[PDB]
A paper describes a structure:
Here we report the discovery of a natural protein, citrate synthase from the cyanobacterium Synechococcus elongatus, which self-assembles into Sierpiński triangles. Bacterial citrate synthase (CS) proteins are homo-oligomeric enzymes that can assemble into dimers and hexamers. CS catalyses the condensation of acetyl-CoA and oxaloacetate to citrate as the first step in the tricarboxylic acid cycle. Using cryo-electron microscopy, we reveal how the fractal assembles from a hexameric building block.
Three dimers are first arranged in a hexameric ring and three hexamers then connect into a triangle. In the 18mer (level 1), CS dimers assemble into hexamers through a heterologous interface similar to known hexameric CS proteins. The 18mer is then formed through an additional contact between two dimers of adjacent hexamers. This interface has an unusual geometry, whereby only one monomer from each dimer participates in the interaction. The two participating monomers form an interface between the amino terminus of one monomer and the carboxy terminus of the other and vice versa. An interaction between the residue E6 from one monomer and H369 of the other establishes an important contact, and mutating either E6 or H369 to alanine or deleting amino acids 2–6 (Δ2–6 SeCS) abolishes the formation of fractals. In the two non-participating monomers, the termini face outwards. They cannot engage in the same interaction with another dimer without causing a steric clash and thereby passivate the edge of the triangular assembly. In the 18mer, the non-equivalence between chains allows the interaction to form at the correct angle and ensures that no more dimers can associate into it.
Numbering used by the authors:
A (entry chain C): 5 to 112, 117 to 379
B (entry chain D): 5 to 113, 118 to 223, 225 to 286, 290 to 377
C (entry chain R): 5 to 114, 116 to 223, 226 to 377
D (entry chain H): 133 to 223, 226 to 263
Write the structure that this text describes.
């Protein structure tokens, strides 16, 4: 009868978390504009809005912040386990393994809808920071109880307390990637949660799915391409080579947005401010040169730079290792996954798709003595 | 034919592994009858057939067996890592954690199709037996290089050499569950493998999503069989469960209703095992009573009702009924990953929004 | 719910005219061993057996042969039409065009005994004359009138080359044709059968079959080209290195379903060596022998054997035939199988009308100017 | 021998093997290194190779060991210093095997001869000082 090759257009579920429409360039969380929300809100408020659907009060926000701060300490058993981890592996695989192991310590009624989400939102940043410290041989750093969430994460990663403006910029960047439309990772999380086992297995499976093919990321390959460009003078030859071969130049042109998606422009403005207040460096200069040399002709076909191109530069200037790009995206991604799991917990119906068999019929086994 | 809640009946992919037929109750692996295949074939041959799609010759099977036996050893780093696991955990969560940790040691990435599958097929039973011993308290036991796969697993688990008849019965019981139609776990594994990351992640996701609510049917059926009391107490509790409008577990499969071959073949192997080697009499009494007293609703004992008994007799802990099923299903998971590696479909279902538009963020609430 | 990809392994029709083994390397025409027919049977006897299913009698065979000889004359209008053809067109396309145009002059469509025999005999007789005439025209030479004295293969060779060949060469060509007469169901045969299902006429069916027979860019000729490119035996090692590195099946060696030393290959190589010892050995045939030996000495363990196409191309080249004419020779050899399939399908009437799977969007809106 | 075999096993992530009190010296070392019991002929060949490699004249390593031992502190420090100074730059026979593998079959003999002729230097693995 009918058969869509890969669930390309079939509706999965009655989503009510976010909504994206490329025609008007609108991206709303719980039907709230992204730019207006991110203008005067923090990451915790956005997470609460995504999880519960309604803006909290000052007292509830303060209580939630206190609970988040209280649950930042990591168990020493996990630190010992990471001390027993190897070093040649990739950080995302270790993060997935640690998330899977997290379920062992915490398991097993109304309270078990609030403790799990806060624990999972709090432990993962400290966990990835501790693994990053262990990978280079340094000991983990015990988190402080006075700094902000972004400030705490930066202190864990780089053992240097950053400026408040840098913390605000990092918080804005985190809440920018807070949640997007349904994709491979989100659908995997949804199908895993359809059996209502626990948030830990769901987040482990979703992180495993999020792992890029060939163990790479879009930001990593964008940085590799920027390095392969070389000096400023060599901008034109590489760009015309990429245009000639009829291959989509990385970091230019999205798949769903062709009307200048607000995330790209807001992240570009944030990058401009951060690069102007701090040291300019040649990174921003070469980035501006190449982006202008591309957009001076790519605008004809509606190709514009995407979010990852600016996000990589922002992370590089912030002083973060290249291999840690994926976990930073994963923080906001698990923030969204917890909301998808909360939505999915209401209706109890596992996904049970059928298939059309395309094989032989009515064969027989042959003993080894003949074949 | 676009939207349907639950996503039921919508075709997903051109699968060519397992076949089903409700009206006839048949089951085939690459178009080979399940009963005939289980009668005169081993587990390794079945795994090779499910993965590569063609039966192996003598030299191929010998090389596969040699590689399996050589790679069955477990690196001591895994043992040291599993030493730190808490003793209050659950076996399936530990299995998922171990399968996730395995990715670190074998990241790598023409030959990246055969080494990964053999390593992942060999190391899983050793890891699960090691964690069972660690949770019990004793140290692990190194595997032998003479015993059969089922025999080696039994020796690792119960530290006793099993009889060849028991090894054969466990091998056939394992290969019975080697594959089934697409379900939640298989679909999740297919979605994860659509991005072609690595086997060590899709298998971890599949074993994570395989856990049922409350953390299969074997534990509950064993609990109900133990709690039924004596032979004279079969009628009271059974009619109490009938009257309370609760579906009787261990009976009435959703799709199969014509005495699927798996159930009858497992019953036959259980019968032939029990006589040569309590539970037996009470179980046959209760199943006979239920069959004779329903007789109208198409009530038939499915596979798990006797799989629980055959596992309990062989000396397996009650909690360990899930990891053995995971070990059986990992072959089908790897087969599905191998099949889906070529498609590169990249599943991406689009949702439908049912909320509001153009709201405002109030500074004070 | 079943759906095979590429319509593989589907019992399209209940054909009883040809049979293959696949395990013992047996090939049967009407359940008769290929070697037995190839030993002491002419092409016309094989064609009659394929068309009718029963071995002909002496009087019937003589009558059929005389009828074939009497209809070897081509209408002058066909020559005038082929005159206007360009000289760049590949031969098989012109053959298809001429076969399609033949239908204009014959539109009986209704006696009934005549319209089971006259059409098939004319279609079997006029094709060699047409292809030879176009071959002569492509070089700007006047077509040669056929002779009513030589044999079938002898007449075709005389028309193509104007030089009378030896009877041994004529017999070799005839047995090559009769071993190339018909095979199992393939793409061309399936297209011919589906076209004939509506029982319109044999001319359109054969035109469609010859049109779909032409492959991409119009194997044996490619094998000869590669052999010429290799040259002497000093260049064997780069060929082996290329075949090892590419990890792909070398063209002209092995069959998709036959890995059991196909019976046609040994017969064809026997005929080739007979022809080369009778008419002397040329250096390129010895080069072919050397390269095939150097291939088989290594590819034997993998189950790779020389294919019939290589020997067929070699014998055609040794017989003095242009490389571009390999496909029309295959077409005239195969034209018996298509007629047999049309005849056997004409008994029944089952129009092919399979369903389809819709993998497109279900409903959209028409943008007026946007 | 036990220490070096244990580190060899550890480097590959394998549990060290307990020594056996029944085999011979070279046999025990081979069993510890490979877990496979070797033939007595191979054990004798290894033993005689060791005994012909037992000691040589004074060289850099022996001189360092002697100068360290001059102050008669302890044998452990002396042997540690000797084994430390024994390691050459970038840690010959292994290089010979690598070069042999690089050459491959006898079809590549002539470039080796051309290189040895042109370099005008003593080819490693051939000749003694």
């Amino acid at each position: 009868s009918e058969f869509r090759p890969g669930l390309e257009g079939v509706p999965a579920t009655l989503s009510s978390i976010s909504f994206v429409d490329g025609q008007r360039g609108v991206l709303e969380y719980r039907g709230i504009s992204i730019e207006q929300l991110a203008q005067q809100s923090s990451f915790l408020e956005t997470a609460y809005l995504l999880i519960w659907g309604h803006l909290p009060t000052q007292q509830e926000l303060t209580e939630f912040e206190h609970e988040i701060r209280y649950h930042r300490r990591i168990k020493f058993r996990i630190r010992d386990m990471m001390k027993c981890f190897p070093d040649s592996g990739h950080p995302m695989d270790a993060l997935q393994a640690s998330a899977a192991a997290l379920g062992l310590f915490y398991s097993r009624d109304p309270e078990y809808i609030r403790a799990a989400v806060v624990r999972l939102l709090a432990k993962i940043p400290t966990m990835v920071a501790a693994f990053q410290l262990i990978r280079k041989g340094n000991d983990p750093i015990q988190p402080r109880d006075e700094l902000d969430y972004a400030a705490n994460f930066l202190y864990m990663l780089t053992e240097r307390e950053p400026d408040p403006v840098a913390a605000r910029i990092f918080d804005i960047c985190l809440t920018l990637h807070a949640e997007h439309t349904i994709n491979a990772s989100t659908f995997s999380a949804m199908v895993t949660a359809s059996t209502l086992t626990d948030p830990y297995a769901v987040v482990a499976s979703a992180v495993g799915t999020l792992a890029g093919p060939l163990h790479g990321g879009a930001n990593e390959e964008v940085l590799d391409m920027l390095e392969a460009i070389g000096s400023v003078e060599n901008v034109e030859p590489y760009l015309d080579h990429c245009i000639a071969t009829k291959t989509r130049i990385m970091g230019f042109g999205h798949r769903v947005y062709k009307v200048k998606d607000p995330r790209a422009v807001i992240l570009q403005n944030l990058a401009e401010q951060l690069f102007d207040i701090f040291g300019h460096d040649p990174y921003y200069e070469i980035a501006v040169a190449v982006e202008k040399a591309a957009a001076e002709r790519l605008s004809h076909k509606g190709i514009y730079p995407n979010v990852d191109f600016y996000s990589g530069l922002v992370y590089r200037k912030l002083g973060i290792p290249s291999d840690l790009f994926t976990p930073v995206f994963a923080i906001a991604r698990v923030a969204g996954w917890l909301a998808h799991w909360k939505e999915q917990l209401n209706e109890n119906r596992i996904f049970r798709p059928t298939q059309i068999y395309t094989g032989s019929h009515n064969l027989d086994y042959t003993p080894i003595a003949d074949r």
